[PDB]
Design an enzyme around this catalytic site. Sequence first.
Site, PDB file in Angstrom:
ATOM      1  N   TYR B  91       0.807  -1.196   0.000  1.00 13.35           N
ATOM      2  CA  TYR B  91       0.000   0.000   0.000  1.00 13.35           C
ATOM      3  C   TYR B  91       0.850   1.259   0.000  1.00 13.35           C
ATOM      4  O   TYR B  91       0.340   2.351  -0.266  1.00 13.35           O
ATOM      5  CB  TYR B  91      -0.992  -0.027   1.163  1.00 13.35           C
ATOM      6  CG  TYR B  91      -2.081  -1.071   0.968  1.00 13.35           C
ATOM      7  CD1 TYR B  91      -2.959  -0.997  -0.106  1.00 13.35           C
ATOM      8  CD2 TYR B  91      -2.231  -2.134   1.862  1.00 13.35           C
ATOM      9  CE1 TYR B  91      -3.960  -1.949  -0.285  1.00 13.35           C
ATOM     10  CE2 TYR B  91      -3.229  -3.085   1.691  1.00 13.35           C
ATOM     11  CZ  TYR B  91      -4.090  -2.986   0.618  1.00 13.35           C
ATOM     12  OH  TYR B  91      -5.094  -3.911   0.456  1.00 13.35           O
ATOM     13  N   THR B  94       1.571   1.840  -3.768  1.00 14.89           N
ATOM     14  CA  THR B  94       0.439   2.481  -4.404  1.00 14.89           C
ATOM     15  C   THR B  94       0.300   3.950  -4.040  1.00 14.89           C
ATOM     16  O   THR B  94       0.015   4.775  -4.910  1.00 14.89           O
ATOM     17  CB  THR B  94      -0.857   1.727  -4.096  1.00 14.89           C
ATOM     18  OG1 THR B  94      -0.868   1.338  -2.718  1.00 14.89           O
ATOM     19  CG2 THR B  94      -0.948   0.488  -4.967  1.00 14.89           C
ATOM     20  N   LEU B  95       0.503   4.288  -2.770  1.00 14.28           N
ATOM     21  CA  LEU B  95       0.405   5.678  -2.335  1.00 14.28           C
ATOM     22  C   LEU B  95       1.489   6.487  -3.053  1.00 14.28           C
ATOM     23  O   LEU B  95       1.235   7.549  -3.613  1.00 14.28           O
ATOM     24  CB  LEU B  95       0.603   5.777  -0.814  1.00 14.28           C
ATOM     25  CG  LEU B  95       0.692   7.183  -0.186  1.00 14.28           C
ATOM     26  CD1 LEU B  95      -0.554   8.020  -0.546  1.00 14.28           C
ATOM     27  CD2 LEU B  95       0.851   7.053   1.323  1.00 14.28           C
ATOM     28  N   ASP B  98       1.243   8.125  -6.676  1.00 12.90           N
ATOM     29  CA  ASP B  98       0.514   9.355  -6.921  1.00 12.90           C
ATOM     30  C   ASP B  98       1.479  10.517  -7.109  1.00 12.90           C
ATOM     31  O   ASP B  98       1.104  11.546  -7.657  1.00 12.90           O
ATOM     32  CB  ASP B  98      -0.429   9.685  -5.767  1.00 12.90           C
ATOM     33  CG  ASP B  98      -1.544   8.677  -5.615  1.00 12.90           C
ATOM     34  OD1 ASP B  98      -2.062   8.188  -6.648  1.00 12.90           O
ATOM     35  OD2 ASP B  98      -1.911   8.389  -4.456  1.00 12.90           O
ATOM     36  N   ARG B 180     -13.360   6.913  -9.043  1.00 16.18           N
ATOM     37  CA  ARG B 180     -13.139   6.584  -7.641  1.00 16.18           C
ATOM     38  C   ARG B 180     -12.958   5.086  -7.442  1.00 16.18           C
ATOM     39  O   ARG B 180     -12.159   4.655  -6.610  1.00 16.18           O
ATOM     40  CB  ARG B 180     -14.302   7.105  -6.790  1.00 16.18           C
ATOM     41  CG  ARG B 180     -14.115   6.943  -5.283  1.00 16.18           C
ATOM     42  CD  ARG B 180     -12.748   7.426  -4.840  1.00 16.18           C
ATOM     43  NE  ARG B 180     -12.696   7.654  -3.402  1.00 16.18           N
ATOM     44  CZ  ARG B 180     -11.605   7.519  -2.657  1.00 16.18           C
ATOM     45  NH1 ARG B 180     -10.456   7.150  -3.207  1.00 16.18           N
ATOM     46  NH2 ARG B 180     -11.663   7.761  -1.356  1.00 16.18           N
ATOM     47  N   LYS B 230      -9.810  18.389   4.912  1.00 17.01           N
ATOM     48  CA  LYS B 230      -8.484  18.822   4.469  1.00 17.01           C
ATOM     49  C   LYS B 230      -8.430  19.296   3.022  1.00 17.01           C
ATOM     50  O   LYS B 230      -7.481  19.960   2.629  1.00 17.01           O
ATOM     51  CB  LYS B 230      -7.447  17.709   4.664  1.00 17.01           C
ATOM     52  CG  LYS B 230      -7.286  16.786   3.469  1.00 17.01           C
ATOM     53  CD  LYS B 230      -6.059  15.894   3.619  1.00 17.01           C
ATOM     54  CE  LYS B 230      -5.712  15.176   2.304  1.00 17.01           C
ATOM     55  NZ  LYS B 230      -5.326  16.113   1.193  1.00 17.01           N
ATOM     56  N   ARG B 302      -2.430  13.923   8.922  1.00 15.06           N
ATOM     57  CA  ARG B 302      -2.624  14.176   7.506  1.00 15.06           C
ATOM     58  C   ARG B 302      -4.020  14.770   7.256  1.00 15.06           C
ATOM     59  O   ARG B 302      -4.176  15.700   6.473  1.00 15.06           O
ATOM     60  CB  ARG B 302      -2.451  12.860   6.733  1.00 15.06           C
ATOM     61  CG  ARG B 302      -3.060  12.844   5.331  1.00 15.06           C
ATOM     62  CD  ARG B 302      -2.857  11.501   4.603  1.00 15.06           C
ATOM     63  NE  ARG B 302      -1.624  11.464   3.815  1.00 15.06           N
ATOM     64  CZ  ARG B 302      -0.393  11.477   4.327  1.00 15.06           C
ATOM     65  NH1 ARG B 302      -0.213  11.522   5.642  1.00 15.06           N
ATOM     66  NH2 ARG B 302       0.664  11.454   3.521  1.00 15.06           N
ATOM     67  N   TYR B 303      -5.027  14.252   7.954  1.00 18.03           N
ATOM     68  CA  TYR B 303      -6.404  14.705   7.772  1.00 18.03           C
ATOM     69  C   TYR B 303      -6.821  15.958   8.539  1.00 18.03           C
ATOM     70  O   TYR B 303      -7.870  16.533   8.255  1.00 18.03           O
ATOM     71  CB  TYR B 303      -7.345  13.533   8.064  1.00 18.03           C
ATOM     72  CG  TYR B 303      -6.978  12.331   7.218  1.00 18.03           C
ATOM     73  CD1 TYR B 303      -7.282  12.296   5.854  1.00 18.03           C
ATOM     74  CD2 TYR B 303      -6.211  11.293   7.745  1.00 18.03           C
ATOM     75  CE1 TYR B 303      -6.825  11.267   5.040  1.00 18.03           C
ATOM     76  CE2 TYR B 303      -5.749  10.261   6.936  1.00 18.03           C
ATOM     77  CZ  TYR B 303      -6.057  10.256   5.586  1.00 18.03           C
ATOM     78  OH  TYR B 303      -5.573   9.258   4.772  1.00 18.03           O
TER      79      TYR B 303
END
Lengths: 350, 352
Positions: B91, B94-95, B98, B180, B230, B302-303
């Site tokens: 994961y 995948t992140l 971006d 999405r 955010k 982060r959020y």
Amino acid sequence: PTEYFLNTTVRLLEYIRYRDSNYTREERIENLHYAYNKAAHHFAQPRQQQLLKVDPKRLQASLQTIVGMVVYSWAKVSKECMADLSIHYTYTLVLDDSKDDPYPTMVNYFDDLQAGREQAHPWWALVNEHFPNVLRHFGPFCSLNLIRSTLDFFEGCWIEQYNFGGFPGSHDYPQFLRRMNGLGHCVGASLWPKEQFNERSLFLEITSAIAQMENWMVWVDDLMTFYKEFDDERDQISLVKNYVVSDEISLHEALEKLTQDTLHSSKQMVAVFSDKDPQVMDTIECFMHGYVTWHLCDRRYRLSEIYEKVKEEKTEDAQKFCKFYEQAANVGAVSPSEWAYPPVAQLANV
Amino acid sequence: NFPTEYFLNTTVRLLEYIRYRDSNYTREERIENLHYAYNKAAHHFAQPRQQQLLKVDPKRLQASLQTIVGMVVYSWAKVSKECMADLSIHYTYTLVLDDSKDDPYPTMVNYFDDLQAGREQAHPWWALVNEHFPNVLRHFGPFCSLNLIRSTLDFFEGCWIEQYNFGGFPGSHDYPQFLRRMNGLGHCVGASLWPKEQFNERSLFLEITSAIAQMENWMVWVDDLMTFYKEFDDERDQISLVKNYVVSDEISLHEALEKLTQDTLHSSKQMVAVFSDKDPQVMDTIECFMHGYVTWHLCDRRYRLSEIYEKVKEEKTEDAQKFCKFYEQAANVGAVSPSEWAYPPVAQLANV
């Protein structure tokens, strides 16, 4: 044996302004035969014959249903592309039946893939070996879409073998399975051969087309297949039926849900591509119309078993259903003897 | 301006519908897992080959890795430490993708032929990811594995599409969810919740398949709601699910947000209504994923949700309090200092 089927079918065909007018009978036959001839010779080869465990009479009927679907809906692509597309979609239809369990053959799927060893599952061994013949017609983006949708399809069949329509209350299951087995990205992407379209110049329109068409195409199919399904339903798990089970609603409410989604999809398809690149609109248009023509004519969908039950009425519904069915059959009703020959089995021996 | 009241209401309702509560997952355990997963991953990304082919700024990689390990350890609570470590690596790959704005086109021209022939892929991300994939896949059966493979492939196309910064043609209603579902990793996540050492894929096929189908939408929507704060004023992020509803459906941000909440809530209720009575171990894995997934969003800076917990910290309304109550609950088990597990830094291990 609901005859309400006519009610919904009518408003759709009208809304999309179903006319077809693709090809001239002469052209239709040229393509139907070209596509069939290449596919037939392909499936008749000893390797295809051995690994593709499928009843001959069944393979034959499948190939003819597909060649028709492709030629009738991929109206603007080259003959070669129709042929190769016919082979790929015939492979998918064949699998659509197999009752063989995939589990044991998928245990080393990734490792074999990553190592470049032939896949254990015979279907994969054939589809992958043939795939380059379909991919050569497209750019990298579309190709990725074809590859993914076929992979999804494979999973879809796996799930279908469990003849499960979803737990009651599992609202999301119905469409999930449909998209999984609908080949929507495969279809909507194979509509743009690099020979006539540039993926980079029409990336946005192509991407948009793949998105919108995925639902139009599958819903329109679920609607056209509502007859063939319910009729002699062999424990089927169609979208409509799964809507009933999973959403706890009548077979009427479900059907009214599909019809509404279809009518909306058609509406938006037009409002979006109506004013974009005319060549894109032409392909989308030819697909929609040819796709409806194919459904009304192919026997597989037993839609005749309906015309021969309402030609007597003349109102709004059941009246125009025969008015449309007439139109379609007049351009789409072609005798197999005029193109589908010789039979696959015949080329297989020799 | 931000709909703090409206936001608070749906968040609380969400947490109620999913029965957000305390687990037997102790902080001493969380830290054991956090550190374990981070340590295997850190060493992995610190290998020279990973260092060469993976183009990421070092500090973003450190941060991306720390956010992912948090997400995995907190949500995949019932899997082993190895499984948490390996999923943390996947994961993170995948992140990290971006962060690339390089056109995939030229690196994908021979994708299929190279794949079929067994030749390393041209796009370096695929090269690293497919080389490491067996480490993730060994924890799962064939069916689940296929879902992980498919979702990751979807993800790749999702990043490709996003490079165009496209929210959809006005009128293209099917575009938003299409995108999405493409970049969400729904089937990857949903299927990775069932290691073959704890679940029998075939004996629970219907249960698993159903969890995948419903989890895909719960997860992405819940995440879209949690990130909605955010990204409200973030002029850099222009193509989120909600921002695309505004553009593709031609509606207001409020109507789009209203669309998101209803989907998020109905999804939650149906999740509970479907799995409450099913196999107990399954519902446990599902319930922990939901609680952890929410805890993680609430505790990861982060959020910036603490900005909301601090604004309505002492309001006397019901929602505000119900929220602060939930938030504090999360902070008790979730709020942990990175110095307790995330060390040494990837860069220091790489340099070594």
